Amino acid sequence: VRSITLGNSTITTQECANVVVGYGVWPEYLKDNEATAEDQPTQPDVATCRFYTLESVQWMKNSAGWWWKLPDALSQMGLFGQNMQYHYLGRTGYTIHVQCNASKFHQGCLLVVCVPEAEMGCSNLNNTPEFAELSGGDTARMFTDTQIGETNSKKVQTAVWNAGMGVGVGNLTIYPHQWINLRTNNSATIVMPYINSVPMDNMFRHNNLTLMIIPFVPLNYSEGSSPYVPITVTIAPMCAEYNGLRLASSQ
Amino acid sequence: YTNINYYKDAASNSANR
Amino acid sequence: YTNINYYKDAASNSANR
Amino acid sequence: YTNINYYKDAASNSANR
Amino acid sequence: YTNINYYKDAASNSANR
Amino acid sequence: YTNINYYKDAASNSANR
Amino acid sequence: GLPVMTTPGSTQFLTSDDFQSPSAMPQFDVTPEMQIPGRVNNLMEIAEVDSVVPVNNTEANVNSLKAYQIPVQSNSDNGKQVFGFPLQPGANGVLNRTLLGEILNYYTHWSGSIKLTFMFCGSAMATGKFLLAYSPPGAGVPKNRKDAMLGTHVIWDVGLQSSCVLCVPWISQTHYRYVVEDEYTAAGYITCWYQTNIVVPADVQSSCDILCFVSACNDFSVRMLKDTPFIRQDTFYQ
Amino acid sequence: GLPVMTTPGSTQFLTSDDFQSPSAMPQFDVTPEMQIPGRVNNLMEIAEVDSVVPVNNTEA
Amino acid sequence: GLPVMTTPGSTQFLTSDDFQSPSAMPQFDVTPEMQIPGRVNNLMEIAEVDSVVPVNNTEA
Amino acid sequence: YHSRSESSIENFLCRAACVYYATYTNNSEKGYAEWVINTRQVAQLRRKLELFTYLRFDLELTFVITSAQQPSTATSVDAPVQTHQIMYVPPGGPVPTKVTDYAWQTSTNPSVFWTEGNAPPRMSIPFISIGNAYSCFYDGWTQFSRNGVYGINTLNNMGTLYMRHVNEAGQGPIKSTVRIYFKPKHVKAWVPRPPRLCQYEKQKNVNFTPTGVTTTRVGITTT
Amino acid sequence: YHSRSESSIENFLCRAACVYYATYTNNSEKGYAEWVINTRQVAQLRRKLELFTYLRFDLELTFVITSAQQPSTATSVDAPVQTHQIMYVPPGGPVPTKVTDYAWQTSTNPSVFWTEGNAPPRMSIPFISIGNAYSCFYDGWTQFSRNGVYGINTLNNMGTLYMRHVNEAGQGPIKSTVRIYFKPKHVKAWVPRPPRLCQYEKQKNVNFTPTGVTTTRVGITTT
Amino acid sequence: YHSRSESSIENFLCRAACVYYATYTNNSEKGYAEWVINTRQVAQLRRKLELFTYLRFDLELTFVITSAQQPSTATSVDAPVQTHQIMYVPPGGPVPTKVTDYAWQTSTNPSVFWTEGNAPPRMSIPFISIGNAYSCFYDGWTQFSRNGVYGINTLNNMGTLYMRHVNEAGQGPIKSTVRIYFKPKHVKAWVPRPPRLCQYEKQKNVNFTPTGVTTTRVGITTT
Ligand SMILES: CCCCCCCCCCCCCCCC(=O)O
Ligand SMILES: CCCCCCCCCCCCCCCC(=O)O
Ligand SMILES: CCCCCCCCCCCCCCCC(=O)O
């Protein structure tokens, strides 16, 4: 009923899908009065502000959850990643669209939440997690229903009930979020603005956002129903801006 | 001075006389 | 200052000079 | 007194209440 | 302050400058 | 207070800010 | 100089005083202010955000997401109890660690209505009616649906609404209740009962789950700031 | 600062003094006032109420 | 005298404070001011003057 | 032509009165003091307050802290000036268990630091009751079953004061006593009650031993 | 009819909290103390600040300095009042290496001299971040290669405090402790975050050991 | 949009800096201290002033005076609080030669009496040069024959400070140190000069030992 078009890509939702807008702030380009970099910014628009679909994950009956780090997850997506590589600074919003369809004979509930500055804890108390453990680019990193042992030197403490941040998982609703209840909805759409303490930042050294999908009520169905229920995440940068054009970074 | 409240809270005021 | 009573009681005042 | 800033810097002011 | 006599006696005043 | 010179000499004043 | 007389309280350092002090960095030029989303002006704004309630806080569920799942199924009887907990937002484990409960533990007194939301997370084919009741204190907890329905209650039909928002009214002898447990300021009990039954077709799982959310209403307030009992220390962190 | 001179009585604690002091609970929101019967403004009101006199105050 | 209450920071000597102090030489008649070239009002004026950069800063 | 100014409730109650004093020595980890705040442990202020059934007032708090040198064996004891900390812990807050407890961080609890030789510390407290007035008497119980605690103690949930030496112990122990003074201000009183005749016996109740109504005289005509 | 004044961010944070304390003795050339300024070494203020992602405030600094007499063998120890110096060294400035170091000239570094027995020293500090707000959390690295330091510690470049006895040592050693108190004022907060549930483990990161979401009860109907 | 307020000459120089400190003991008739006033005995303030050729400012003077107990053989040393006198002697005035000298009458010389335990003494001084500005550098001689003294020392005729214990000596010697702090105010500067690169060697001249212009790196392309 409702179609959202960005660039040459289009997604469709129900006319009453109730899009969640961040903290009530729509993404916007950086204003002159709050900019510090002096060079003229690059605004690729249609080439970068479009829906990119990541790899799908399977919602299993014992699934604990998944997470993606936002700027890193799109680091290899078309011209967005190229601009990231060729520019020192960048800022952008996002439109996160999570898709999970199932029959009326299925049940389950997911929490889709966007967490700004989701600093994560390490299984070894004396260390910090490595980049491979903190992010997998397009690939999703998985929460665990058990506790990671202290032997592991540089892994993320992935216990779901603490959400890798030493907090209460049920209190994650303070961050912009939407519930995917299979009884009522099959998708969630969260539009998030650029949130940082500085007007622009380096897109490789700093992950501004983290998208978490956590099943609060496990998926269930009777024998005969389709057992394979994927979850597909589609993300579109909004008002992407870049500064400091130079040679491409290796990473 | 004669009478000036130095604090923003009413409980800080002197007695009612 | 020059002359301001700081207290609500007359006995607190300075001498009559 | 009631409210007078004694310093030239805003950080010297009391809390916003 | 700038100049206010706090005492009732002239001998209490500061120097003539 | 806000700004009142308490002394008769200019050298006694606070800094020029 | 001007004659002055020092009063009691001179030279004292009271941690909640409000005085001016000299700046150690005169004429420092601060970084310009920048618009950041999500400005917060009052902790009540945090306390008014719904958080998932761990109603199933058994010893085997507190280290997983099962603590938040309220079981529900098709029964062969009538008027069975689904759950029940005291309305102790600052002292009871059920509500202690939610957003509202965490804000409350920084204070000593509280007052206002509490918004309870229940979302049914079964299949779309399931039907059922539930009785959600709030019993003011003075008697015990209600022991059956007949006792429960004599107080404040609402009938929730999962077939018509997947989410029911029950606003527990403020009924107290005092304007405020203590955050800590105190019988003089008992607030009552919240209970849920089967109004008819969970009914499902063939090839649908009869066992479903309900999620409960809690948040403060618009008339909520707190008083008497204090240190929370949830964080502690033995030595400085290095 | 402004030149001042401290007088006798400085730092003393007189139990019948009347001074202002800092509040330990800034911006505390007190419970609203409620009308209660029998407000008393002066002890003479109590002293003006008749009470039974023990005129026969023998030891027994 | 006027009732006062001393706050924290009393009697402290902070090197960046800005207060008035009594003059040790009352009514001293300073030498008249004379126009001297090269008045400087801000260190940024010095920082804005070009200086030769030792780019070849090898040990020799 | 005669004014009744000095018989006002304000003038009658707006006088500082000692309500308690506690002691603590700097020679142990348990060298701190605690006091559950109440106005019923001293006869004079309790009797003055109990002339009424309900009261509503602000409070001025003043502390008188003194120290005494304890016996020691070290030659040439030379101790620096002592600094004290008094912390208020509202009900439900964490309480200190030793002098070096983490709870003394007082990040949210109101606390006052005061050094010996200066003017007594003083702070103001507003009307902090959950009800519309303080209660001097309560003819009721805390439990709905009318069992357990009976009386005014059911309404006493005002918190606790904690006191300690800030300075680390030196070459000789120091014992300190802190005297707490209450001064009601902006007082409102209701329902006057007969003055207490029998001597007080307990803090938490009105228990008494029967006493004669007045002193005696020989006969009904003795002058 | 009920105001929310005491739940404002100002009232919530504008209370003095101890962030650290250091000790130093007057019996050596290394008898000074240092502290790298940070708000993450104490549980209470850290948890209060970490309810938000970004903060912007001015700071009121108050020091509580106490001394204790150390054991000595000289007869008749009689020490004069002690004067202390606290110097702030911004990053890049020369740091003292001994009590009699030349760096204590504090020609440009801000310093405060305070004598025992007086009111605690106090100064105000503006918002001194190079960014537009202080950061409580930083999901990133300091190096562009994403190796090395990860977390909030990358943004901590606030400098160091140095403390020493001004007085020359006498006939007996004196050990002093300085307690540092932070009071944010004119606070602005953004992006509320879930309160910290697991106990803190380290200063420079968010590392934790998994803990249950709440305390437990017997059954789902237990009251 | 960025202000240069903190790089003003005022803000750069209006910070108190130690210029000297002297010691004196109460155990002799020669137990006084003297200092010929000059701003060239400390590296930091000297370098800050020598960024300019001519300066004109008022001066704020602050003294930090501390005492230490010296070894003694008397049992039970109990000394009262110490009072100090600092006297300024302009050039040509009589100078004290002992603690009990008549010159301490200070009938016309400005002097300050200060007792230990109080706030540091402080006074203001106007611009007292015989010229129209203070001189940091002087490429000339004092004698018309161009023999003898060469350099800035020819212009230094600012007088001498004298310091002593007012109290008569007791049962144990007391050694006191007075730290002198200069704070220029209402500053005017002229003819900026290259910052001093070589380390200072002497007070009365610009003598130096040659040093490299910068630190080194391996090659012209090393990053
Ligand atoms: C360092 C800060 C100290 C703060 C101390 C707070 C004291 C709590 C207020 C007590 C009020 C007592 C009222 C008495 C009621 C009655 O009459 O029964
Ligand atoms: C004698 C002068 C003392 C001057 C001391 C200056 C102290 C520097 C200011 C520290 C600000 C700390 C801000 C904390 C930021 C955060 O929340 O992570
Ligand atoms: C007790 C009274 C003390 C009075 C002390 C008077 C101090 C004399 C003023 C000295 C000014 C020094 C100017 C430095 C000139 C330069 O930069 O070379």
Sign of CA dihedral H39, H42, H44, H46: positive
3-state secondary structure of L182: strand
Torsion of CA K39, K43, K44, K47, to 10 degrees: 80
Dist CA G131 CA G14 (whole Å): 52
**Which residue, A18, A13, A25, is CA-closest to A196?**
A25
Q: How far is the CA of G26 from the centre of ligand 2 (A)?
A: 15
**Are L190 and I20 an interchain contact pair (Cβ–Cβ within 8 Å)?**
no
Return the H-helix or E-strand segment holding A212: strand A209-220
- CB-count burial class (<10 Å; 0-12, 13-18, 19+) for G110: buried
**Are K197 and A172 an interchain contact pair (Cβ–Cβ within 8 Å)?**
no
DSSP-derived letter for residue H45 is: H
How far apart are the two ends of chain L, measured CA to CA in Å? Answer: 32
Dist CA A61 CA A42 (whole Å): 45
Given a contact cutoff of 8 angstroms between Cβ atoms, the answer to whether I36 and L133 are in contact is yes
Dist CA F15 CA I15 (whole Å): 13
3-state secondary structure of A33: helix
Dist CA L172 CA L73 (whole Å): 8
Dist CA G94 CA G214 (whole Å): 10
In K, which residues are within 8 Å of I6 by CB distance? Answer: 119
Q: How far is the CA of L214 from the centre of ligand 2 (A)?
A: 33
Dist CA A101 CA A99 (whole Å): 7
**Are K58 and D11 an interchain contact pair (Cβ–Cβ within 8 Å)?**
yes
Return the H-helix or E-strand segment holding L11: helix L9-13
Q: In chain L, what is the greatest distance between 2 CA atoms, to the nearest angstrom? A: 72
Q: How far is the CA of K159 from the centre of ligand 2 (A)?
A: 8
Given a contact cutoff of 8 angstroms between Cβ atoms, the answer to whether H36 and J191 are in contact is yes
CB neighbourhood size of L94 (10 A): 10
Rounded to 5 degrees, what angle do the CA atoms K17, K21, K23 make? 160
Instruction: Name the phi and psi angles at A47, rounded to 5.
Output: -70, -25
CB neighbourhood size of J46 (10 A): 18
Cite the DSSP H helix spans in G32-144.
43-47, 93-96, 99-104
Given a contact cutoff of 8 angstroms between Cβ atoms, the answer to whether K135 and K54 are in contact is yes
3-state secondary structure of L203: coil
**Which residue, H15, H41, G9, C8, is CA-closest to J14?**
H15
Dist CA A189 CA A212 (whole Å): 13
Instruction: For residue J96, give the amino acid letter.
Output: P
Dist CA G191 CA G168 (whole Å): 12
Percent helix, strand, coil in chain L (nearest 5)? 10, 35, 55
Q: In chain I, what is the greatest distance between 2 CA atoms, to the nearest angstrom? A: 74
Return the H-helix or E-strand segment holding A131: helix A131-134
Chains that touch I (3 or more CB pairs under 8 A): C, E, F, G, H, K, L
CA-to-CA dists, residue G223 to A150, H31, J158, K5, K45, angstroms? 42, 10, 13, 9, 19
Tell me if chain L has a CB within 8 Å of the CB of F8. no
3-state secondary structure of A154: coil
Closest residue on chain L to F10 (Cα): L126
Residue with the two structure tokens 């330990």: H24
- Convert L148-166 to b/e letters by CB count within 10 Å (16 or more is b): eebbbbbbbebbbbbbbbe
Dist CA A78 CA L187 (whole Å): 61
CA neighbours closer than 13 Å in the CB half-sphere of residue E12:
10
Dist CA H12 CA J87 (whole Å): 23
**Which residue, K152, K139, K142, K161, is CA-closest to K59?**
K161
Picking from C8, C12, C13 by the largest number of B CB atoms within 10 A of its own CB, the best residue to mutate is C8
| L:44-63 residues touching chain F, CB 8 A cutoff | 58-59
CA-to-CA dists, residue G204 to A85, A183, A217, A222, K182, angstroms? 51, 12, 16, 6, 59
DSSP-derived letter for residue G97 is: T
**Which residue, I57, A195, G124, G227, is CA-closest to K16?**
G227
**Are H29 and K1 an interchain contact pair (Cβ–Cβ within 8 Å)?**
no
**Are K112 and I8 an interchain contact pair (Cβ–Cβ within 8 Å)?**
no
- Residues making up chain I, counted from first to last: 60
Closest residue on chain I to F11 (Cα): I23
Dist CA K95 CA K109 (whole Å): 11
Dist CA A138 CA A71 (whole Å): 10
Contacts made by residues A5-8, CB under 8 angstroms, sequence distance 24+: A6/A49, A6/A50, A6/A51, A6/A95, A6/A236, A6/A238, A7/A45, A7/A46, A7/A47, A7/A49, A7/A50, A7/A51, A7/A236, A8/A46, A8/A50
State the closest ligand 3 atom to the C-alpha of L40, by its place in the atom list counted from 1. Answer: 18
DSSP-derived letter for residue J94 is: -
Evaluate: CB of K169 within 6 angstroms of ligand 2: no
Given a contact cutoff of 8 angstroms between Cβ atoms, the answer to whether J175 and J96 are in contact is no
Q: Which residues pair with J193 in a beta bridge?
A: none
Dist CA H25 CA G225 (whole Å): 8
Dist CA G122 CA I36 (whole Å): 89
Evaluate: CB of K111 within 6 angstroms of ligand 2: yes
Tell me if chain J has a CB within 8 Å of the CB of B9. yes
Dist CA H51 CA L102 (whole Å): 82
Minimum distance, in Å, between the CA of residue I50 and any CA atom of chain F = 29
Instruction: Name the phi and psi angles at L155, rounded to 5.
Output: -95, 0
Q: How far is the CA of G28 from the centre of ligand 3 (A)?
A: 29
In H, which residues are within 8 Å of F6 by CB distance? Answer: 1-3
**Which residue, J49, J48, J39, is CA-closest to J153?**
J39
* Paired tokens of A170: 């049920």
Instruction: Name the phi and psi angles at A96, rounded to 5.
Output: -95, 125
Given a contact cutoff of 8 angstroms between Cβ atoms, the answer to whether K140 and A206 are in contact is yes
3-state secondary structure of L2: coil
- Which of G6, G108, G139 shows the shortest C-beta gap to J90? G108
Q: Which residues pair with A112 in a beta bridge?
A: A178, A213
Which residues, other chains included, contact G150 with Cβ-Cβ below 8 Å and sequence gap of 6+? G142
Q: Which residues line ligand 1 (CB under 6 A)?
A: H 24; J 37, 39, 49, 55, 59, 61, 86, 88, 110-112, 123, 125, 128, 134, 136, 158
DSSP-derived letter for residue A56 is: -
Pairing of strands L122-125, L52-69: antiparallel
- Which of L16, L56, L216 shows the shortest C-beta gap to I59? L216
Dist CA L9 CA L191 (whole Å): 13
Q: Which ligand is nearest to the CA of L57?
A: 3
Instruction: For residue K194, give the amino acid letter.
Output: P
* Paired tokens of J24: 């603590």
* Paired tokens of J60: 């001025």
3+ Cβ–Cβ pairs closer than 8 Å linking A and K? yes
| Interface B-H: count of C-beta contacts within 8 A | 25
Q: How many helices and strands, by DSSP H and E, does chain L display?
A: 2, 9
